[PDB]
Amino acid sequence: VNSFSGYLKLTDNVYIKNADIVEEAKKVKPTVVVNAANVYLKHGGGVAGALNKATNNAMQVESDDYIATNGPLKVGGSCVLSGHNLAKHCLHVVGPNVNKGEDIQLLKSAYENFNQHEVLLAPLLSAGIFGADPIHSLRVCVDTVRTNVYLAVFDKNLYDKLVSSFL
Ligand SMILES: O=C(O)[C@@H]1CCCN(C(=O)c2ccnc3[nH]ccc23)C1
Numbered sequence: 001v002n003s004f005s006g007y008l009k010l011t012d013n014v015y016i017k018n019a020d021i022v023e024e025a026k027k028v029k030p031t032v033v034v035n036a037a038n039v040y041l042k043h044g045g046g047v048a049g050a051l052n053k054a055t056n057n058a059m060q061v062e063s064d065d066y067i068a069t070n071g072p073l074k075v076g077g078s079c080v081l082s083g084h085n086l087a088k089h090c091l092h093v094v095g096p097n098v099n100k101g102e103d104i105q106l107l108k109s110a111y112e113n114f115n116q117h118e119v120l121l122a123p124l125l126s127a128g129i130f131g132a133d134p135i136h137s138l139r140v141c142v143d144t145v146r147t148n149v150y151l152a153v154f155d156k157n158l159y160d161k162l163v164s165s166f167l
Helices: 021-028 046-054 058-070 106-116 134-144 156-164
Strands: 014-018 032-036 078-082 089-093 119-122 148-153
Touching: 014 134, 014 156, 021 046, 021 119, 021 148, 032 046, 046 058, 058 078, 089 106, 106 134, 134 148, 134 156, 148 156
Parallel strands: 014 148, 032 089, 032 119, 119 148
Antiparallel strands: 078 089
16 A cells, blocks of 8 residues: 555556646655656656756755766666655666657657566656657556556646547
8 A cells, every 4th residue: 555646547557647646646656756857867847847946946956966976867768766755765767869860769768667676656767848749658667567666647637638549
């Protein structure tokens, strides 16, 4: 038993809710919240900008030190940093950005990072401003992640489309 509430169960291990991931993180305080990161951990907009704003820019300060030490992430890669006031940990995961021409096949590699964590609160990778089809992202999620994932979809219209079209 865990504290996630109001989710629709899609599969054995994948759950979905129309929710603001920032507000969901603030209430649940999950062990892991996933950020829709880029390779530079520049949290300017989308999910990343919202998560970072909710940390009062502490996420960005920590991220800048991480990059100064380690260099950029790989597309499809991840790193574990603090969850600040939102979660114990933040798993920064880089899905491919279609608006930059990155290979969509890397979306499966991106979701594989979730398997290193027993339970996660997450957005749909490569959705939103990353330009992928969220229905495809949900399919890859279901077919790749084996650990327990609670997906938060900000847009109610999109949420209904994702549920109604789910196979
Ligand atoms: O989900 C939607 O409707 C939008 C379009 C797809 C990408 N988005 C998210 O992944 C998301 C989900 C939940 N809270 C969020 N806060 C900021 C982004 C965000 C936003």
